[PDB]
């Protein structure tokens, strides 16, 4: 009675430097009382969460937002590295209400040309939030399907608690013909995890492609406050940074330089990918009796592990999630939180 992936085929190329513009539906379909306020308002509530988390888990990526109203698609946020512009946009969109019907193809092409300026290293991907059962297409979608795949842009979409075969085909078509990207929801928490699994990069098996090196520099913080003066926005900045090359007083931003146009990053964003890059194997729950290890947690101090021949209480299980590489145990609360937040296996860290 366990719901776990048999193995995690992460080990190599994933989607790290990302250029995702998720597309929403703003139609009468999103207006209906499927979720407690409705689809859209709860979704807008739900959608807000991922934005910062996307920028949290993937600060090395850029993102804009497009919606679809009354049989027409409408971009609503610029592709940027700052959540706030995207964040503040949804607040109006929260106070805005979905209307009419969505135009899939309008979103198809508006986003398609939107991703044209994206560089090769920045990985192009799109995700869709759809509620209806039909589209509004000014032309041959399969042509656009052909156009997108010719652009080599894999895509995952998540419709509502239903299936669309072409959308099932589209996620298939976008993703090298591999259909694992039309997963749909059945519950709000089951919807919540969709956000939770979305922040992850996307390794399956990347074809041997041109791999590009990157050159940039770190920024240097400005100290004075009374000297308030800004260049990237022509403002007065009571504290900022300096480009490694153009050497411009720049406000706090891990984004690209505005003068010689180079990426400015200190350290934090880099190691975020690292634990993503090489994660650990799950701490294996050691057996109730075949383990016979120390009656305590390893990461934490959880002296209770079972119940010791207590009829079924001990025959239930043994909170003995043991990392295999370290051969050291961990309490489930510790072990799950470890794999949840910080891989950093102390048993493997200690050597």
């Amino acid at each position: 009675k366990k719901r776990t992936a048999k193995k995690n085929i992460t080990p190599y190329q994933r989607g790290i430097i990302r250029s995702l513009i998720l597309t929403l539906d703003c139609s009468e379909a999103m207006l209906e009382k499927d979720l407690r306020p409705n689809r859209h308002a709860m979704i807008i509530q739900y959608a807000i969460d991922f934005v910062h988390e996307f920028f949290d888990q993937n600060p090395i990526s850029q993102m804009g937002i497009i919606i679809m109203r009354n049989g027409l698609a409408q971009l609503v946020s610029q592709v940027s590295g700052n959540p706030q512009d995207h964040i503040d946009a949804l607040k109006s969109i929260r106070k805005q209400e979905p209307k009419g019907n969505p135009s899939l193809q309008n979103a198809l092409e508006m986003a398609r040309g939107l991703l044209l300026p994206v560089p090769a290293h920045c990985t192009r991907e799109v995700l869709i939030v759809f509620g209806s059962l039909s589209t509004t297409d000014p032309g041959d979608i399969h042509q656009t399907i052909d156009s997108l795949v010719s652009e080599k842009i894999r895509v995952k979409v998540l419709g509502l608690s239903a299936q669309v075969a072409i959308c099932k085909e589209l996620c298939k078509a976008t993703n090298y013909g591999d259909e694992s990207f039309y997963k749909i929801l059945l519950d709000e928490t089951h919807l919540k995890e969709l956000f939770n699994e979305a922040v992850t990069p996307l390794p399956v098996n990347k074809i041997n492609k041109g791999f590009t090196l990157v050159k940039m520099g770190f920024p240097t913080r400005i100290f004075e406050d009374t000297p308030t003066f800004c260049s990237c926005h022509s403002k007065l900045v009571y504290g900022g940074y300096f480009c490694p090359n153009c050497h411009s007083k720049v406000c706090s931003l891990p984004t690209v330089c505005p003068c010689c146009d180079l990426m400015l990053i200190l350290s934090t964003h880099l190691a975020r990918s690292y634990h993503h890059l090489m994660p650990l194997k799950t701490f294996a729950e050691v057996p109730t009796t075949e383990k016979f290890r120390s009656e305590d947690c390893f990461s934490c101090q959880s002296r209770f592990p079972x119940x010791x021949x207590x009829x079924x209480x001990x025959x239930x299980x043994x909170s003995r999630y043991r990392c295999e590489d370290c051969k050291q145990e961990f309490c489930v609360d510790c072990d799950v939180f470890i794999h949840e937040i910080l891989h950093n296996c102390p048993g493997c860290e200690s050597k």
Binding site: S134, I141, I166
Partner: protein, 754 residues
């Protein structure tokens, strides 16, 4: 896969297998050992064709005796499905073993789709396309071509390059599917019609519609070399008893009677004009009648036969001189005496079902023409027309029906029925009498095919119960067993909407008309699906006229815009050409993002041959009970015959037959175990017929699903879709219903040898 049934390798084309298939494989070989009938029910959700072909193809390649295999399907559309399936299996059989085929296997549809001559192919009517190429490539026309150099006779030239290269050998080695065949034949500018025509004695397996086995007018070229020691395979043959009686059915109209006079009088001119020119051959043909039936050149006809054998294939035939009818002038005279008597019998003011004997005696009382020589009309007309070498058939089209009919009724008695309606009730109070005629027992035509062979295979995913047909066709099978769908998941929700949102017992039996209490409830019931259902949804009316009846008022109702506001709507069209264009576009729209919704008739042709995969088959609708007594007591007449012949009454047979046709439509929602779709039904009486269903269908029906409301059913199907839409891939319990590749069938079944 390559396993054994204790005697033969099984080169199964797919890595996966299914539990039904091995049980299917268990019985087919067992039946193959003891050549019998063995009516079996195999669920349509599973692809029985794979289980069908694989064991059979190996059987011929393992057992060295049955070199000829025969499969009869309902449609040539199924044939091309079988044609590629065999081709894929044949490729796989070579793929697993190398090259061990040396095999000849082809389909058989018609000249219409196999006459590759563009001009003859351009013509619309199947009769003309057959007749044109028959005339264009004729045994006598080529004489008019070869003996007298002229442009008067052209040729297909596909039949000629057939005689040039093709009639020395076969097509090189392909098991040509219709696409592959047509692609090959066109590049060879060949005629797949004449190819299979000569390839009758060469194909190691032949696939064709039941009629080439059933319809004696086309089941006449039967060669015992490919027939006698062969095996006959049938799937979805439940809706064939009607076809058998239909194959002996014959409707008449006084307009055609005038057309008969049109042709028959034209015969007088045709025989007289040649008589002035060359009656010596006609006199010679009289000697050819004096020696006998002129089988020397009424059968040995490469492209000559004008009148085919509409009666059973020459079983009930005499061959002596027709007394005085030897003279063509006499021959037409009795015919002319007959058609007017037929007219005098057509002009009956009311509907009369006349016995074959009493009507014949009544004819004898009116026109003293004898029964036995009357059968000679078909042979004499085929004989005379070619001697007349007529250049047209349209005036004579009515005549061959008489040559058909006059021979038929003169050959048939107390198993057939002649009934003379004075009009059609749907357009009553106007003169349009029909001298309707047909058989009564389907097994009559099945008896010779029963007689000719022992190894015969019948299967269906619809047949229920498997006992009516042995009663109906009066035969003994070996194994009468039904197979159940080994599904660890629902994959279909059988729903009996006896009660609507109004909770009203809703029905189609009340009338063939509209009552918004039932109808608008149905319209309101339907629309909610359009919103929730994805692309792919069809309805099946009991009657096309009933179909149109509900359409206009629902169009008048505001119900029509919303479903268009939700999905796309495509209609069933009387011409299949527009229907086909609708169907592909419907599937195209079903393949497209914009949802597609269809509407058909439970008796419609779509339920006959057209299957629909997961996306294409999602939500089937049974518009009330499909019932057929909208028409006259000709149903009852055969049913009364049925009731006296067999201890089966109307409703018992009706429920059996109606649910047979109901289940006939429903088999098209599924492609494989990956396929799924809710099966909704809306009629009050549907709850009663829970027993009449096929086993797996009945097994899939829980008792809690009876007389459900649409609203509660909406909730029921609501969760079903998402679960099915969810990627349910346990990959461990699947092997229970998959019998994992080449291992579990080897492991489990060999373990289950106890």
């Amino acid at each position: 896969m390559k396993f054994y049934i204790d005697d033969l390798p099984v080169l199964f084309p797919y890595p996966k297998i299914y539990p039904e298939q091995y049980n299917y494989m268990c019985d087919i070989k067992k039946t193959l050992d003891v050549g019998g009938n063995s009516i079996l029910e195999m669920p349509s959700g599973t692809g029985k064709t794979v289980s069908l072909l694989s064991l059979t193809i190996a059987y011929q390649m393992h057992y060295p005796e049955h070199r000829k295999i025969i499969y009869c399907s309902r449609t040539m559309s199924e044939i091309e499905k079988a044609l590629v399936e065999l081709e894929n299996l044949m490729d796989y059989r070579t793929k697993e073993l190398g090259y061990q085929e040396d095999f000849r296997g082809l389909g058989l549809t018609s000249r219409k789709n196999l006459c590759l001559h563009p001009e003859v192919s351009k013509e619309r009517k199947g009769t003309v396309v057959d007749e044109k190429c028959r005339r264009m490539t004729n045994g006598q026309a080529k004489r008019k071509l070869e003996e007298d150099p002229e442009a008067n006779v052209e040729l297909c030239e596909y039949h000629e390059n057939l005689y040039n290269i093709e009639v020395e050998d076969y097509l090189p080695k392909g098991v040509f599917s219709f696409e592959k065949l047509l692609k090959y034949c066109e590049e060879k500018t060949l005629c797949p019609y004449f190819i299979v025509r000569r390839m009758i004695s060469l194909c190691n397996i032949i696939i064709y519609s039941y009629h080439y086995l059933l319809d004696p007018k086309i089941a006449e070229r039967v060669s015992n070399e490919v027939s006698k020691d062969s095996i006959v395979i049938f799937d979805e043959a439940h809706n064939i008893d009607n076809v058998c009686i239909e194959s002996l059915s014959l409707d008449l109209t006084t307009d055609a009677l005038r057309r008969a006079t049109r042709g028959a009088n034209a015969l007088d001119e045709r025989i007289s004009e040649v008589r002035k020119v060359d009656s010596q051959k006609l006199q010679d043909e009289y000697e050819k009648l004096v020696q006998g039936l002129h089988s020397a050149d009424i059968l040995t006809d490469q492209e000559e036969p004008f009148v085919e054998t509409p009666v059973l294939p020459q079983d009930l035939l005499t061959e002596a001189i027709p007394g005085n009818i030897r003279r063509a002038e006499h021959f037409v005279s009795f015919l002319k005496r007959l058609i007017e008597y037929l007219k005098t019998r057509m002009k009956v003011l009311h509907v009369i079902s006349e016995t074959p004997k009493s009507f014949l005696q009544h004819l004898k009382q009116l026109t003293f023409i004898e029964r036995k020589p009357l059968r000679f009309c078909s042979e004499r007309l085929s004989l005379l027309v070619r001697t007349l070498e007529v250049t047209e058939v349209e005036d004579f089209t009515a005549l061959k029906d008489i040559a058909t009919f006059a021979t038929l009724i003169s050959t048939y008695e107390e198993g057939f029925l002649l009934i003379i309606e004075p009009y059609e009730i749907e357009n009553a109070a106007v003169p349009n009498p029909i001298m309707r005629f047909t058989c009564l027992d389907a097994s009559i035509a099945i008896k010779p095919v029963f007689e000719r062979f022992s190894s015969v295979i019948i299967t269906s995913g619809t047949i229920s119960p498997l006992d009516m047909y042995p009663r109906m066709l009066n035969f003994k099978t070996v194994l009468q067993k039904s197979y159940a769908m080994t599904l660890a998941k629902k994959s279909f929700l059988p729903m009996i909407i006896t009660k609507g949102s109004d909770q009203v017992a809703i029905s189609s039996r009340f009338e063939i008309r509209n009552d918004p209490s039932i109808v608008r409830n149905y319209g309101s019931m339907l629309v909610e699906f359009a919103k929730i259902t994805p692309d792919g949804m069809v309805v099946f009316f009991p009657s096309y006229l009933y179909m149109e009846s509900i359409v206009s008022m629902w169009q008048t109702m505001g119900i029509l815009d919303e479903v268009w506001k939700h999905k796309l709507i495509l209609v069933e069209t009387p011409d299949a050409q527009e229907t086909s264009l609708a169907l592909e576009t419907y599937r195209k729209a079903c393949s497209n993002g914009r949802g597609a919704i269809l509407l058909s008739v439970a008796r419609g042709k779509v339920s006959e041959g057209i299957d629909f995969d997961h996306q294409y088959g999602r939500t089937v609708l049974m518009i009330g009970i499909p019932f057929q007594y909208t028409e006259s007591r000709i149903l009852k007449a055969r049913l009364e015959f049925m009731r006296e012949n067999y201890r089966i009454r109307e409703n018992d047979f009706l429920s059996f037959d109606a649910m047979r046709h109901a289940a006939q439509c429903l088999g098209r929602v599924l492609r494989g175990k990956d396929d799924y779709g809710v099966m909704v039904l809306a009629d009050r009486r549907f709850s009663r017929k829970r027993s009449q269903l096929p086993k797996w269908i009945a097994q899939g029906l829980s008792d809690a699903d009876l007389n459900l409301s649409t609203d509660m059913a909406i909730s029921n199907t609501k969760q079903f879709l998402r679960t099915m839409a969810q990627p349910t891939d346990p990959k461990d319990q699947e092997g229970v219903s998959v019998w994992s590749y080449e291992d579990l069938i080897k492991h489990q079944n060999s373990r289950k040898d106890q």
